[PDB]
Design an enzyme around this catalytic site. Structure first.
Site: not given
Ligand SMILES: [Cu+2]
Ligand SMILES: [O]
Ligand SMILES: [O]
Ligand SMILES: *[C@@H]1O[C@H](CO)[C@@H](O)[C@H](O)[C@H]1NC(C)=O
Ligand SMILES: [Cu+2]
Ligand SMILES: [Mg+2]
Ligand SMILES: [Mg+2]
Ligand SMILES: [Mg+2]
Lengths: 325, 325
Positions: A1, A16, A20, A56
């Protein structure tokens, strides 16, 4: 994450969350133009951007290499002994449509000193669907009533090229529609489950105006305020339970797995209230109530469909969803 | 010399075109007829027959059992030498006898081409119906799989009817419209238009082909517009235009073969044009394109001596077809 639970963020970083920001800033990657962060840099806005879903899926495939690494489930892994799904049916047509929804924009505008507010609203078109009921006929040939977990997924039959998918090719595309725990009495009985009760979804939120009205009325009158009927805001919107489908109709596989609820909920009580959104949002203030891997029993490779077809407590049937434009 | 006899003669000449003729009368003619024996049968008193016989006697003609392309300059020249002879015949016995004689001497692809355009462009051909080329040379219209089943049916001496499927797979969205360009009749329409209106036509062959350059524009405009209507019918966007400096997005595997010459070549997806040795450089195509657009935007075509030919007039489109083809 990555999260603060990561055992080694110095080495593994934060793929992740950093992605973003990487994606969000591609309109001004070096900061030359003084642009603010992209929509990908807020959870309020991220799914507006098409690239959200490409990012994703990329991440999902990382997880998938891990879940694909385990041995496929066997008959003995999957069988809930003495529990057969005899039939799966739906009461009511599966129909989607668009309707209208309003919310207030007052907080977005600037209020003058001692000039009165005026009502300013946005009206959006949103997907919705008609209510329906699952009818799952199960035969319990164990000598006693048994707690069962009902796991309900919607799976594609064909892709956009009209090619029929194998179960192994469909399983990672299935979407979760429901998960619930219910005692199955001995004998043959049809379990009824309303679409409105899905543990995947929650209703539209009450408006700010409504919350102000209710709180003000209670405080000003000295009455107790009971908002307990309101659900959490975590969960797929009830209105988006089903995919849009097509005006001409589309057929899908409705997949039902009935599993041993005593094993699945061990330590979490099968009588206790697990709330309205436990499938993906868990239970507020409590442990997650289903011990099985998320996605069970579709989260491992299924190279041999015969294995699933030989398990009496698993059944899929064809359903049709029609969009009304 | 009647239509029944002429039709039968053509039928016989085109029968089993890859093998020596099986008709005793045509074998006798091919053995004993001298194309130079009586020049009074030609309108040019034998000039065209002399040219072709010299090429034949000097061993300069393409061998039998070899691929033929009308776009190959020398092979076209050879086919047109036979066309020229047939076109000079005053009476049918000249046409039939020369056809029978050169059938056994010349490449089968050249011969079929010359015989078809000879029938079409000679008054002696009036009333004859040419057999469909997909039955005279089926390899040019039938994918290799089905030909192999035909080869197998012949090797095993067993009759059969074999289903032809379109090229590609369902993953190939272009296969959605394969029924257009792969239709055997659409292919005959296209070859026959060019046989009726050949780019090699010179009015010294006997008559003028009225408005040919404008009909060249129109027939291909209609092919393009009709194809796009099939794309629209199949949830596809219109075709893009080619450009010499951009990739050709959509490749192609014909899965077809020549009778002699091997499998037709494939083109991969997303390739840039490369120069073709012996044909042209990609840059030559760009220059040619530029020169045509110069004429269009000038409003005149430039003649060999530099004088202008006005195209701001109804025949301008025809003159453009003349110079573009
Ligand atoms: Cu995400
Ligand atoms: O996300
Ligand atoms: O996320
Ligand atoms: C070929 O097609 C015909 C009709 O189009 C059908 O009857 C037959 O089953 C097909 N043959 C094969 C081998 O699929
Ligand atoms: Cu053409
Ligand atoms: Mg709920
Ligand atoms: Mg089994
Ligand atoms: Mg060669």
């Amino acid at each position: 994450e990555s999260s603060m639970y990561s055992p080694n963020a110095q080495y593994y970083g934060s793929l992740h969350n950093t992605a973003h920001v990487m994606l969000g800033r591609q309109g001004d990657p070096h900061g030359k133009f003084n642009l603010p962060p992209g929509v990908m840099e807020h959870f309020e806005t991220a799914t507006r951007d098409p690239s959200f879903f490409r990012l994703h899926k990329y991440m999902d495939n990382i997880f998938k290499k891990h879940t694909d690494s385990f041995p496929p489930y066997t008959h003995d892994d999957l069988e809930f002994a003495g529990m057969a799904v005899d039939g799966v049916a739906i009461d009511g047509e599966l129909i989607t449509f668009f309707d209208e929804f309003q919310y207030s924009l007052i907080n977005a505008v600037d209020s003058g000193e001692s000039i009165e507010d005026v009502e300013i609203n946005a009206r959006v078109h949103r997907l919705n669907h008609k209510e329906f009921t699952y009818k799952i006929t199960v035969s319990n040939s164990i000598g006693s009533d048994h707690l069962a977990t009902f796991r309900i997924f919607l799976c594609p039959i064909e892709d956009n090229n009209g090619i029929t998918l194998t179960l192994d090719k469909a399983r990672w595309l299935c979407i979760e529609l429901d998960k619930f725990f219910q005692k199955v009495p001995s004998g043959t009985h049809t379990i009824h489950r309303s679409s409105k009760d899905s543990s995947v979804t929650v209703p539209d939120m009450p408006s700010f105006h409504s919350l102000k009205e209710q709180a003000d009325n209670a405080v000003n009158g000295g009455h107790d305020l009971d908002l307990s009927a309101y659900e959490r805001s975590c969960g797929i919107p009830d209105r988006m339970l089903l995919p849009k489908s097509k005006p001409e109709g589309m057929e899908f596989n409705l997949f039902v797995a009935v599993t041993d609820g005593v094993k699945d909920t061990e330590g979490h009580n099968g009588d206790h209230d697990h709330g309205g959104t436990h499938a993906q949002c868990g239970v507020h203030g409590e442990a997650y109530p289903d011990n099985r891997p998320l996605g069970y029993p579709l989260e491992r490779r299924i190279p041999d469909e015969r294995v699933f077809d030989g398990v009496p407590n698993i059944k899929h049937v064809v359903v049709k969803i029609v969009h009304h434009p | 010399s009647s239509t029944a006899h002429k039709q039968q003669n053509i039928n016989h000449l085109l029968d089993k075109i890859y093998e020596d003729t099986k008709y005793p009368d045509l074998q006798e003619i091919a053995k004993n007829f001298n194309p130079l024996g009586d020049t009074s049968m030609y309108n040019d008193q034998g000039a065209a027959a002399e040219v072709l016989m010299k090429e034949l006697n000097d061993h300069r003609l393409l061998e039998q059992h070899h691929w033929y392309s009308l776009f190959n300059a020398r092979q076209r020249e050879e086919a047109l030498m036979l066309f020229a002879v047939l076109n000079q015949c005053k009476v049918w016995h000249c046409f039939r006898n020369n056809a029978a004689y050169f059938r056994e001497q010349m490449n089968e692809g050249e011969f079929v081409y010359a015989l078809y355009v000879g029938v079409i462009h000679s008054k002696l051909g009036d009333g004859i119906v040419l057999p469909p080329l997909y039955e005279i040379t089926p390899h040019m219209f039938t994918n290799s799989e089905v030909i192999d089943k035909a080869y197998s049916a012949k090797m095993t001496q067993k009759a059969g009817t074999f289903n032809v499927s379109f090229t590609g797979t369902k993953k190939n969205k272009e296969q959605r419209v394969a029924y257009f360009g792969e239709d055997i009749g659409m292919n005959i329409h296209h070859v026959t238009w060019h046989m009726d209106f050949p780019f090699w036509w010179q009015d010294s062959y006997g008559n003028h082909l009225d408005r040919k350059g404008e009909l060249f524009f129109w027939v291909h405009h209609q092919l393009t517009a009709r194809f796009d209507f099939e794309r629209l019918s199949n949830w596809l966007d219109p075709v893009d235009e080619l450009h010499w400096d951009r990739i050709i997005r959509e490749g192609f595997a014909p899965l077809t073969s020549y009778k002699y010459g091997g499998e037709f070549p494939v083109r991969p997806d997303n390739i840039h044009f490369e120069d073709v040795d012996g044909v042209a450089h990609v840059h030559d195509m760009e220059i040619t394109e530029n020169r045509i657009y110069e004429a269009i935007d000038h409003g005149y075509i430039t003649a060999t001596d530099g004088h202008t030919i006005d195209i701001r007039q109804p025949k301008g489109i025809e003159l453009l077809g003349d110079i573009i083809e």
